[PDB]
Structure formats: C-alpha cells, structure tokens
Scaffold this motif. Structure first.
Motif, PDB file in Angstrom:
ATOM      1  N   UNK A 171       0.678  -1.164   0.071  1.00 54.11           N
ATOM      2  CA  UNK A 171       0.036  -0.098  -0.199  1.00 54.11           C
ATOM      3  C   UNK A 171       0.904   1.258  -0.191  1.00 54.11           C
ATOM      4  N   UNK A 172       1.895   1.313   0.869  1.00 55.83           N
ATOM      5  CA  UNK A 172       2.876   2.597   1.111  1.00 55.83           C
ATOM      6  C   UNK A 172       3.370   2.636  -0.401  1.00 55.83           C
ATOM      7  N   UNK A 173       3.827   1.543  -1.023  1.00 50.70           N
ATOM      8  CA  UNK A 173       4.822   1.798  -2.365  1.00 50.70           C
ATOM      9  C   UNK A 173       3.683   2.482  -3.547  1.00 50.70           C
ATOM     10  N   UNK A 174       2.383   1.998  -3.417  1.00 49.80           N
ATOM     11  CA  UNK A 174       1.487   2.320  -4.460  1.00 49.80           C
ATOM     12  C   UNK A 174       1.174   3.720  -4.031  1.00 49.80           C
ATOM     13  N   UNK A 175       0.974   4.077  -3.022  1.00 51.47           N
ATOM     14  CA  UNK A 175       0.921   5.484  -2.550  1.00 51.47           C
ATOM     15  C   UNK A 175       1.898   6.329  -2.822  1.00 51.47           C
ATOM     16  N   UNK A 176       3.059   5.931  -2.859  1.00 49.85           N
ATOM     17  CA  UNK A 176       4.285   6.609  -3.352  1.00 49.85           C
ATOM     18  C   UNK A 176       4.538   6.571  -4.862  1.00 49.85           C
ATOM     19  N   UNK A 177       3.836   6.229  -5.553  1.00 49.11           N
ATOM     20  CA  UNK A 177       3.805   6.194  -7.151  1.00 49.11           C
ATOM     21  C   UNK A 177       4.323   4.847  -7.688  1.00 49.11           C
ATOM     22  N   UNK A 178       4.397   3.745  -6.976  1.00 46.70           N
ATOM     23  CA  UNK A 178       4.935   2.602  -7.442  1.00 46.70           C
ATOM     24  C   UNK A 178       3.988   2.175  -8.897  1.00 46.70           C
ATOM     25  N   UNK A 179       4.856   1.608  -9.746  1.00 46.24           N
ATOM     26  CA  UNK A 179       4.311   1.141 -11.100  1.00 46.24           C
ATOM     27  C   UNK A 179       3.809  -0.284 -10.987  1.00 46.24           C
ATOM     28  N   UNK A 180       2.460  -0.156 -10.582  1.00 45.71           N
ATOM     29  CA  UNK A 180       1.546  -1.298 -10.346  1.00 45.71           C
ATOM     30  C   UNK A 180       1.739  -2.542 -11.570  1.00 45.71           C
ATOM     31  N   UNK A 181       2.005  -2.035 -12.495  1.00 45.57           N
ATOM     32  CA  UNK A 181       2.275  -3.102 -13.976  1.00 45.57           C
ATOM     33  C   UNK A 181       3.602  -3.384 -14.138  1.00 45.57           C
ATOM     34  N   UNK A 182       4.622  -3.000 -13.457  1.00 49.43           N
ATOM     35  CA  UNK A 182       6.171  -3.238 -13.651  1.00 49.43           C
ATOM     36  C   UNK A 182       6.067  -4.680 -14.146  1.00 49.43           C
ATOM     37  N   UNK A 183       6.908  -5.040 -15.061  1.00 53.06           N
ATOM     38  CA  UNK A 183       7.330  -6.347 -15.493  1.00 53.06           C
ATOM     39  C   UNK A 183       8.635  -6.748 -15.234  1.00 53.06           C
ATOM     40  N   UNK A 184       8.902  -7.703 -14.764  1.00 54.78           N
ATOM     41  CA  UNK A 184      10.587  -8.380 -14.509  1.00 54.78           C
ATOM     42  C   UNK A 184      10.814  -8.911 -15.814  1.00 54.78           C
ATOM     43  N   UNK A 185      12.183  -9.573 -15.741  1.00 52.39           N
ATOM     44  CA  UNK A 185      12.670 -10.076 -16.881  1.00 52.39           C
ATOM     45  C   UNK A 185      12.073 -11.099 -17.461  1.00 52.39           C
ATOM     46  N   UNK A 186      11.133 -11.944 -17.210  1.00 50.00           N
ATOM     47  CA  UNK A 186      10.261 -12.897 -17.290  1.00 50.00           C
ATOM     48  C   UNK A 186       8.904 -12.435 -17.519  1.00 50.00           C
ATOM     49  N   UNK A 187       8.556 -11.327 -17.518  1.00 41.48           N
ATOM     50  CA  UNK A 187       7.323 -10.705 -17.700  1.00 41.48           C
ATOM     51  C   UNK A 187       6.269 -10.821 -16.664  1.00 41.48           C
ATOM     52  N   UNK A 188       6.717 -11.125 -15.286  1.00 45.43           N
ATOM     53  CA  UNK A 188       5.615 -11.207 -14.309  1.00 45.43           C
ATOM     54  C   UNK A 188       5.398  -9.893 -13.690  1.00 45.43           C
TER      55      UNK A 188
END
Length: 346
Positions: free
Chosen positions: A56-73
C-alpha cells in the motif's frame, strides 16, 4: 555494479517487511520503482512476501503497479501465485492489469488456479480475467487446476468458460447447447456455492435471451423449477440474476410463458413486488409484464395471483421507472395497452 545503494536498501526493506524503513527510505528520495538487473521492483518483492502494508505504501508513493520483470511477471502474478488475497485486491484497485501475460503466456489466473487460491480466482474473474486464456502451450486455468487436483477451482473455471460463450455469438450458444452444457448449468442452480450459482444464472439467462428455440432448450434442460426456487434466496444478487433469466424465458411464446407459470413463479414474483430493492422489484414487474403479454389464460393466471392490487399500489411508487412499468402491465392486463413490449436482458 549498476544501481545505487539507496535503491538496494529499499528493495531489501520491502522484501524484509520493514515498514518504517521503507517509509524512511522513500522520504529520503529512494526511487519507488528501483529495479535490479532482473527488473524486480520493491512492489514485486512485497507482493511475493505478502507484506500488505508495504504494498500500500509503495503504491501511494507512485510504484508502477504493472511493472514487468525479466520474465514478464507483474506484482499481480506474484500475489496470485503466493495466495495473498488482500494484496491481489489492492493491486487491482490501483490499476493492475488482470490479463497481463508473462513470456510464455501465463496470466495471474493461471497461477491462482494452478495453486488452488479459490477466492483469488473469484476476484480475478470478477475483475475481467479471461477464463479461457491459453499459454503458449495451450493450457488454460482450468487445465492447470485439473492437473493440480483443484476441482473446486476447475469447476468454477468451467462455469466461467460457459458464461463467456453464452454471452457470445449465436454459433457460440448453439455449440454450447450441442456439447451438453445446459444440464451442467442447471445442476449448478442447486449449488451451495454462490459463485457457481451466479455463473450458471448468467449463462442460462444469456442463452434464454437469444430466441424462442434457445428458450426452449433452457426449459427442456429443466431450468424453470430451479430458477423459481432461487427466488427465496437471501442474496439480492442471486435474486436479480434469477429474475433476469425468468424475464427472458417469459419473453417467449405463450406455451413457454405457461411453463413459467406452471413452475410456480407467480406467487414469488408477486411477493417480490414488495422488495425495497428497486432493481429486484422492477425485474419481478418485468417478468409479470412479459407473462401478461401472453394469451388470456396467462393474463388470467396473473390476475388470480393477486397482481392487480399490487400493480395499482405501484402507481404511487417514488421510482418513476417502476411507475411506468406498473401502468403498462396494468394496461396489458385490462385495456389492451400491450405496446409495453417484451422486456429482455441481453
């Protein structure tokens, strides 16, 4: 070598569940979207480890909710796999892509289904997950649930597949009937699982919206007694869906209307005119109005059920849609004002 120690510390605090440290590092300018060489972000780590507050705190601070890692997760993939229901809900509320696929075509629903996280499956489906999504090898969520022995998930996924096809084309519906889905759908109208009831009611109601031959297939599969008996449900969503299906069946021919009457619908429909839920009320009214569009035997049955007095009362209802439907139903029954048309839920 690349990347800052400040970013590294944020990743570690998110992984470890150190809520106050995450706050302090963000206050000191740590990049909320820091990504290591593998594309893993603080939000990925918090979702995998189940740290809801940090998510919740990360999202409140603007975290990219749809960030992909190197295997697309995405974080939603990881929360669905690890079984963190509230995190799944928070991610979706903050815009997570419910149909995101990784590098082999796996969606969050695949992972939740394969590992038996039933409530997560329900939430993903409610948010628009493609129930029949195939990975690069052709596997669907149902396939993976079956392969892992999660028959409760597999049955819900199967019903969701049926509901999707039932909302599709005429050829889709005809194939559903040909392949014998109707007996399964009708059987599920007795399920103690509300999620099954809802899926089956949607599918059957949608099938009954596509013509009198399709209505007849639904009748012939035995849907009417179950639909009528569901009108004593304490769940207003179930009542609405059962009523929509009955509205559609009662839009058919006079013999199909009579089948609705003969299954016992009238006492329940008349009683439902007293609901304070105006969406339930108007659907019961529309069912009665469709029935009143039949012949004189059908009209007389409606009158003998006591509908006239309740319809007259509804002319003073505060809801003007209900007032109009009630007046049209009364005119159908009394003064040949039958241009009210057939109600239908498509």
């Amino acid at each position: 070598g690349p990347g800052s120690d400040l970013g590294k510390k944020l990743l570690e605090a998110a992984r470890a569940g150190q809520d106050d440290e995450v706050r302090i590092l963000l206050a000191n300018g740590a990049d909320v979207n820091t990504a290591d060489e593998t594309g893993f972000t603080p939000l990925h780590l918090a979702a995998w480890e189940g740290h809801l507050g940090i998510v919740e705190v990360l999202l409140k601070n603007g975290a990219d909710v749809n960030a992909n890692d190197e295997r697309g997760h995405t974080p939603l993939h990881l929360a669905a796999y690890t079984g963190h229901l509230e995190i799944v809900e928070v991610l979706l509320k903050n815009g997570a892509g419910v149909n995101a696929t990784d590098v082999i075509g796996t969606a969050p629903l695949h992972l939740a289904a394969m590992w038996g996280h039933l409530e997560i499956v329900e939430v993903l489906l409610k948010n628009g997950a493609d129930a029949h999504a195939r990975d690069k090898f052709g596997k669907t969520p149902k396939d993976l649930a079956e392969d892992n022995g999660n028959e409760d998930v597999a049955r819900l996924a199967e019903l969701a597949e049926y509901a999707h096809k039932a909302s599709g084309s005429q050829d889709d519906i005809q194939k559903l009937i040909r392949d014998g889905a109707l007996p399964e759908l009708v059987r599920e109208l007795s399920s103690p699982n509300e999620s099954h009831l809802q899926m089956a009611l949607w599918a059957l109601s949608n099938i009954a919206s596509g013509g009198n031959e399709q209505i007849q297939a639904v009748i012939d599969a035995g849907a009417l007694p179950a639909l009528v008996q569901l009108l004593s449900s304490p769940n207003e969503q179930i009542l609405k869906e059962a009523l929509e299906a009955l509205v559609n069946i009662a839009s058919g021919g006079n013999e199909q209307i009579q089948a609705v009457i003969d299954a016992g619908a009238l006492p329940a429909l008349v009683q439902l005119l007293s609901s304070p839920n105006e969406l339930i009320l108007i659907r019961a009214l529309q069912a009665l109005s469709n029935i009143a569009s039949g012949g004189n035997e059908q009209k007389q049955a409606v009158k003998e059920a006591g509908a006239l007095e309740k319809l007259e009362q509804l002319q003073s209802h505060e809801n003007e849609k209900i007032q109009k439907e009630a007046q049209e139903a009364l005119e159908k029954l009394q003064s040949h004002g039958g241009s009210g048309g057939k109600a239908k839920y498509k």
